[PDB]
Design an enzyme around this catalytic site. Structure first.
Site, PDB file in Angstrom:
ATOM      1  N   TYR A  63      -6.991  31.040   4.177  1.00  0.00           N
ATOM      2  CA  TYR A  63      -6.460  29.710   4.434  1.00  0.00           C
ATOM      3  C   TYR A  63      -7.418  28.858   5.274  1.00  0.00           C
ATOM      4  O   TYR A  63      -7.003  27.858   5.879  1.00  0.00           O
ATOM      5  CB  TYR A  63      -5.125  29.854   5.159  1.00  0.00           C
ATOM      6  CG  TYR A  63      -4.041  30.567   4.364  1.00  0.00           C
ATOM      7  CD1 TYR A  63      -3.276  29.880   3.430  1.00  0.00           C
ATOM      8  CD2 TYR A  63      -3.755  31.913   4.586  1.00  0.00           C
ATOM      9  CE1 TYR A  63      -2.281  30.526   2.723  1.00  0.00           C
ATOM     10  CE2 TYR A  63      -2.770  32.569   3.869  1.00  0.00           C
ATOM     11  CZ  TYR A  63      -2.028  31.869   2.938  1.00  0.00           C
ATOM     12  OH  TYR A  63      -1.042  32.485   2.227  1.00  0.00           O
ATOM     13  N   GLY A 107       1.440  37.129   4.660  1.00  0.00           N
ATOM     14  CA  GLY A 107       0.878  38.389   4.190  1.00  0.00           C
ATOM     15  C   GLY A 107      -0.650  38.341   4.107  1.00  0.00           C
ATOM     16  O   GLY A 107      -1.322  39.315   4.442  1.00  0.00           O
ATOM     17  N   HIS A 109      -7.273  30.041  -1.023  1.00  0.00           N
ATOM     18  CA  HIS A 109      -6.020  29.288  -1.057  1.00  0.00           C
ATOM     19  C   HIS A 109      -6.202  27.843  -0.591  1.00  0.00           C
ATOM     20  O   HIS A 109      -5.368  26.988  -0.906  1.00  0.00           O
ATOM     21  CB  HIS A 109      -4.939  29.916  -0.165  1.00  0.00           C
ATOM     22  CG  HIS A 109      -4.424  31.217  -0.663  1.00  0.00           C
ATOM     23  ND1 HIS A 109      -4.273  31.502  -2.003  1.00  0.00           N
ATOM     24  CD2 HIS A 109      -3.993  32.292  -0.002  1.00  0.00           C
ATOM     25  CE1 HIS A 109      -3.788  32.727  -2.123  1.00  0.00           C
ATOM     26  NE2 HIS A 109      -3.611  33.224  -0.919  1.00  0.00           N
TER      27      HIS A 109
HETATM   28  C1  LIG Z   1       9.013  35.260  -2.137  1.00  0.00           C
HETATM   29  C2  LIG Z   1       7.826  35.545  -1.250  1.00  0.00           C
HETATM   30  C3  LIG Z   1       6.762  34.669  -1.218  1.00  0.00           C
HETATM   31  C4  LIG Z   1       5.642  34.896  -0.392  1.00  0.00           C
HETATM   32  N1  LIG Z   1       4.641  33.962  -0.367  1.00  0.00           N
HETATM   33  C5  LIG Z   1       3.629  34.166   0.442  1.00  0.00           C
HETATM   34  C6  LIG Z   1       2.613  33.173   0.496  1.00  0.00           C
HETATM   35  O1  LIG Z   1       2.661  32.105  -0.086  1.00  0.00           O
HETATM   36  N2  LIG Z   1       1.586  33.462   1.378  1.00  0.00           N
HETATM   37  C7  LIG Z   1       1.447  34.626   2.130  1.00  0.00           C
HETATM   38  O2  LIG Z   1       0.445  34.770   2.846  1.00  0.00           O
HETATM   39  N3  LIG Z   1       2.440  35.567   2.068  1.00  0.00           N
HETATM   40  C8  LIG Z   1       3.468  35.337   1.272  1.00  0.00           C
HETATM   41  N4  LIG Z   1       4.483  36.280   1.206  1.00  0.00           N
HETATM   42  C9  LIG Z   1       4.422  37.450   2.107  1.00  0.00           C
HETATM   43  C10 LIG Z   1       5.293  37.198   3.346  1.00  0.00           C
HETATM   44  O3  LIG Z   1       5.009  35.923   3.971  1.00  0.00           O
HETATM   45  C11 LIG Z   1       5.217  38.384   4.327  1.00  0.00           C
HETATM   46  O4  LIG Z   1       5.845  39.527   3.738  1.00  0.00           O
HETATM   47  C12 LIG Z   1       5.837  38.118   5.710  1.00  0.00           C
HETATM   48  O5  LIG Z   1       5.152  37.063   6.404  1.00  0.00           O
HETATM   49  C13 LIG Z   1       5.843  39.405   6.531  1.00  0.00           C
HETATM   50  O6  LIG Z   1       6.617  39.269   7.760  1.00  0.00           O
HETATM   51  P1  LIG Z   1       7.862  40.231   8.045  1.00  0.00           P
HETATM   52  O7  LIG Z   1       8.578  39.900   9.307  1.00  0.00           O
HETATM   53  O8  LIG Z   1       8.582  40.233   6.746  1.00  0.00           O
HETATM   54  O9  LIG Z   1       7.134  41.644   8.212  1.00  0.00           O
HETATM   55  P2  LIG Z   1       7.459  43.219   8.096  1.00  0.00           P
HETATM   56  O10 LIG Z   1       6.725  43.748   6.914  1.00  0.00           O
HETATM   57  O11 LIG Z   1       8.904  43.536   8.242  1.00  0.00           O
HETATM   58  O12 LIG Z   1       6.773  43.605   9.489  1.00  0.00           O
HETATM   59  C14 LIG Z   1       5.339  43.801   9.524  1.00  0.00           C
HETATM   60  C15 LIG Z   1       5.049  45.027  10.349  1.00  0.00           C
HETATM   61  O13 LIG Z   1       5.579  44.821  11.677  1.00  0.00           O
HETATM   62  C16 LIG Z   1       6.334  45.971  12.037  1.00  0.00           C
HETATM   63  N5  LIG Z   1       7.257  45.589  13.101  1.00  0.00           N
HETATM   64  C17 LIG Z   1       8.550  45.135  13.029  1.00  0.00           C
HETATM   65  N6  LIG Z   1       9.086  44.886  14.202  1.00  0.00           N
HETATM   66  C18 LIG Z   1       8.076  45.209  15.102  1.00  0.00           C
HETATM   67  C19 LIG Z   1       8.016  45.181  16.509  1.00  0.00           C
HETATM   68  N7  LIG Z   1       9.033  44.797  17.273  1.00  0.00           N
HETATM   69  N8  LIG Z   1       6.864  45.581  17.106  1.00  0.00           N
HETATM   70  C20 LIG Z   1       5.848  45.979  16.330  1.00  0.00           C
HETATM   71  N9  LIG Z   1       5.787  46.041  15.003  1.00  0.00           N
HETATM   72  C21 LIG Z   1       6.944  45.641  14.437  1.00  0.00           C
HETATM   73  C22 LIG Z   1       6.937  46.457  10.723  1.00  0.00           C
HETATM   74  O14 LIG Z   1       7.431  47.781  10.752  1.00  0.00           O
HETATM   75  C23 LIG Z   1       5.697  46.321   9.831  1.00  0.00           C
HETATM   76  O15 LIG Z   1       4.819  47.431   9.977  1.00  0.00           O
HETATM   77  C24 LIG Z   1       5.602  36.063   0.401  1.00  0.00           C
HETATM   78  C25 LIG Z   1       6.676  36.968   0.334  1.00  0.00           C
HETATM   79  C26 LIG Z   1       7.783  36.713  -0.446  1.00  0.00           C
HETATM   80  C27 LIG Z   1       8.913  37.705  -0.454  1.00  0.00           C
END
Ligand SMILES: Cc1cc2nc3c(=O)[nH]c(=O)nc-3n(C[C@H](O)[C@H](O)[C@H](O)COP(=O)(O)OP(=O)(O)OC[C@H]3O[C@@H](n4cnc5c(N)ncnc54)[C@H](O)[C@@H]3O)c2cc1C
Ligand SMILES: Cc1cc2nc3c(=O)[nH]c(=O)nc-3n(C[C@H](O)[C@H](O)[C@H](O)COP(=O)(O)OP(=O)(O)OC[C@H]3O[C@@H](n4cnc5c(N)ncnc54)[C@H](O)[C@@H]3O)c2cc1C
Lengths: 273, 271
Positions: free
Chosen positions: A155, A149, A161
């Site tokens: 980083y 995220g 971080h």
């Molecule tokens: C418990 C927890 C701990 C976390 N800890 C950290 C941490 O330590 N460090 C950190 O940096 N983050 C952290 N996060 C955040 C997390 O890593 C991010 O939410 C994650 O990396 C996002 O990836 P996703 O696939 O879930 O994205 P999504 O939010 O599902 O996708 C991102 C975007 O891509 C779009 N998309 C999907 N498919 C496609 C496609 N085929 N083509 C184009 N666009 C598309 C989606 O609609 C959206 O707009 C944490 C989250 C949680 C829940």
């Protein structure tokens, strides 16, 4: 050409960018003539908790249950839980393993951590004789594909971080290399939530392009096991002659083997040739 | 009267991990603490984040995002009750002890999941309130870890490499990030070759430590005030701080090594 690849995915949602990266990897690899097996951990409802139930046969000592000893016996006599064995067979067959997941609390998701814990059993995946570069999986290659995220700046060496090289070390050295894997440059996809659509597409395209030649890449550097005295009496310490050879150098060997000196830049992110 | 929470991640009541938990509870109670436990295996705690964690109505079920949806659920109060119960134990506690075996250079899966399901945005961190400004800055935490391998293996020259690097993601990335003052970890090496009489001495040493635990000095992390805390600056170290540090020979911490030498035992000993 005629090679096998396993893709382990740790995300619950088919709508996720993680899922899209997995699909892109499968497509790219298949097109170049690879066989592709998947472990979609959430879709499988994979159980990530080690327990007695992982052994279907007779415990050696149920009164003092020790998972490492008991799981190794079960591996050798063949009474591991079949969900574990199925995953082990995918690993045995595979030349290349890709792990696709979001960074969660500076590490792998719990469901993926559990996969390591239940599947990477002693004898199968490591022994105290065959560690690191001498491990069972030294014929295989692995690569992490991570989304975050937060932004790349966070980083960097100067970011809030701290260095991403340090975060990856326990995973790449501690889990993957320990079992023998040659570990390839990680694919890092920063701030994916705040990346615009056209940029996301380029990322997918770049991933697919990378995978066409993935096998010919140089792996990341870890200290060879031959630098160490591999027995209990020496305490698994670096050999004295190696210590003396390194006394004058300004950089350490790796993130974990920094030796009190400077860490070689991007030891865990970029290979050197 | 101060409150302590003990989180344990071992399946076996016959384990030294279990014994360390019992010893901690006894020592703390004797000095007049209130002690709550989360025995994750005994509770059959569910460690997997999912839709089921939100009992009310999703904002967007078609594009489900756990971070956004869990935060709404926290604020509107439709988190799964198993999560809320744990959150209440944390809110009440001044001291949190985590007792577990080192597994693949990290925490057990069941404990990783506890962090993932319980340390929700707004509750445990925000974006404004990170690191030393985090919600848990009144609280203190300590890791109590066992390993099978010997201490020499996790020394600077050992095959596995520096233990300080292994602990960093947990102590900085999880605990300090949410605000905790993090105390020197209790490290029990080569527990598998340690005989019964020796284990008891170790327990006695642990109990003795806990009598004065609150007055200890915590581990050093870089203060957030060294950084520009906004999106436009990219959360980078301030230029004035960079210039002041240019000439120093040691970095600030394991994560903030700055290309230089890591201060010895940054993650294992306080100053
Ligand atoms: C418990 C927890 C701990 C976390 N800890 C950290 C941490 O330590 N460090 C950190 O940096 N983050 C952290 N996060 C955040 C997390 O890593 C991010 O939410 C994650 O990396 C996002 O990836 P996703 O696939 O879930 O994205 P999504 O939010 O599902 O996708 C991102 C975007 O891509 C779009 N998309 C999907 N498919 C496609 C496609 N085929 N083509 C184009 N666009 C598309 C989606 O609609 C959206 O707009 C944490 C989250 C949680 C829940
Ligand atoms: C999946 C997995 C991954 C692992 N990865 C790693 C790794 O990466 N690195 C690493 O170093 N290690 C690793 N390990 C090893 C693990 O960390 C150790 O085995 C663990 O530290 C052992 O502690 P325990 O509490 O489980 O003790 P146990 O061995 O279960 O118990 C010790 C003994 O003490 C006895 N006892 C109980 N109460 C008392 C008392 N009051 N006084 C005296 N004796 C008592 C018990 O009866 C028992 O015989 C891994 C293990 C697993 C299962």
């Amino acid at each position: 050409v005629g090679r096998r690849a396993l893709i382990v995915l740790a995300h619950s949602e088919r709508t996720s960018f993680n899922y899209a990266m997995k699909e892109a990897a499968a497509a790219a690899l298949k097109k170049k003539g690879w066989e592709v097996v998947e472990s979609d951990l959430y879709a499988m409802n994979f159980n990530p908790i080690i327990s007695r139930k992982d052994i279907t046969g007779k415990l050696k000592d149920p009164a003092n249950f020790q998972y490492p000893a008991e799981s190794v016996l079960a591996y050798k006599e063949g009474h591991l839980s079949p969900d574990i064995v199925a995953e082990q067979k995918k690993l045995e067959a595979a030349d290349l393993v890709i792990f696709q997941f979001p960074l969660q609390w500076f590490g792998v998701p719990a469901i993926l951590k559990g996969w390591f814990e239940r599947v990477f059993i002693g004898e199968f995946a490591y022994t105290y004789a065959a560690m690191y570069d001498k491990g069972p999986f030294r014929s295989k290659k692995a690569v992490l594909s991570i989304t975050t995220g937060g932004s790349g700046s966070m980083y960097s060496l100067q970011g809030i971080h701290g260095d991403m090289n340090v975060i990856l070390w326990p995973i790449q050295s501690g889990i993957l290399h320990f079992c023998g894997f040659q570990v390839l440059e990680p694919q890092l996809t920063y701030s994916i939530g705040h990346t615009p659509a056209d940029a996301r597409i380029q990322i997918l395209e770049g991933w697919k392009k990378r995978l066409e030649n993935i096998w010919d890449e140089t792996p990341l550097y870890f200290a060879p096991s031959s630098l160490f005295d591999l027995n209990f009496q020496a305490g698994f310490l670096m050999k004295k002659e190696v210590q003396d050879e390194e006394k004058n150098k300004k950089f350490g060997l790796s993130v974990g083997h920094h030796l009190g000196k400077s860490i070689p830049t991007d030891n865990q992110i970029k290979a050197r040739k």
